[PDB]
Amino acid sequence: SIQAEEWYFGKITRRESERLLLNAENPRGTFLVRESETTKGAYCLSVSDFDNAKGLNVKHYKIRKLDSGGFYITSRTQFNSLQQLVAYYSKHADGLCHRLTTVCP
Ligand SMILES: O=P(O)(O)Oc1cccc2c1NCCC2
């Protein structure tokens, strides 16, 4: 159950996810997973980033779920579960702003 994962924040808004992540103590890749505000059946992975251009900022990626039972951000790289998707992105940045590092405090 995705609801038992400490990185799953359930039904919080995008603005609230930004408030939690825009903390100067958060290193790049600090993240959380929440329900999408407008897309029924999709989740959003919210991730903190940092560069000298923008400083501290937050990106949101849509995690799609297939009825066949697969989870993915890009259809070319799918996973059997949200847990496996999170594990994969903690090691590969691929197209994300940064690899996932720490669960949002
Ligand atoms: O849940 P939100 O606020 O991040 O709003 C969205 C609704 C649906 C999809 C997405 C949202 N924000 C941009 C990225 C994808």
Side-chain angles (χ1 to χ4, degrees), residues 5 11 38 45 54 87 102:
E5 306 302 314
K11 188 199 173 179
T38 51
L45 168 64
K54 307 181 168 188
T102 121

Side-chain angles (χ1 to χ4, degrees), residues 8 10-14 33-45 61-63:
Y8 185 62
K11 188 199 173 179
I12 59 169
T13 59
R14 179 197 195 83
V33 166
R34 57 179 176 87
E35 280 185 9
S36 157
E37 287 183 0
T38 51
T39 306
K40 171 74 164 44
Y43 300 97
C44 292
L45 168 64
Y61 303 101
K62 189 182 282 180
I63 294 181

Side-chain angles (χ1 to χ4, degrees), residues 16-29:
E16 169 73 354
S17 74
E18 294 168 339
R19 190 189 62 84
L20 292 168
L21 295 161
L22 286 176
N23 180 322
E25 298 185 5
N26 294 334
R28 303 181 64 188

Side-chain angles (χ1 to χ4, degrees), residues 44-64:
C44 292
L45 168 64
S46 299
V47 189
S48 75
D49 193 22
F50 183 92
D51 59 39
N52 283 329
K54 307 181 168 188
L56 184 67
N57 67 106
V58 178
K59 289 295 191 189
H60 306 277
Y61 303 101
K62 189 182 282 180
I63 294 181
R64 291 185 167 82

Side-chain angles (χ1 to χ4, degrees), residues 47-93:
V47 189
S48 75
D49 193 22
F50 183 92
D51 59 39
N52 283 329
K54 307 181 168 188
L56 184 67
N57 67 106
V58 178
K59 289 295 191 189
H60 306 277
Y61 303 101
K62 189 182 282 180
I63 294 181
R64 291 185 167 82
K65 155 63 176 309
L66 285 162
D67 262 73
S68 317
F71 287 87
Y72 65 80
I73 291 175
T74 173
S75 69
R76 296 181 196 207
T77 310
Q78 320 193 167
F79 307 82
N80 290 330
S81 71
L82 205 48
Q83 289 84 162
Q84 293 172 309
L85 181 150
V86 168
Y88 174 94
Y89 288 106
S90 297
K91 303 273 205 168
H92 312 254

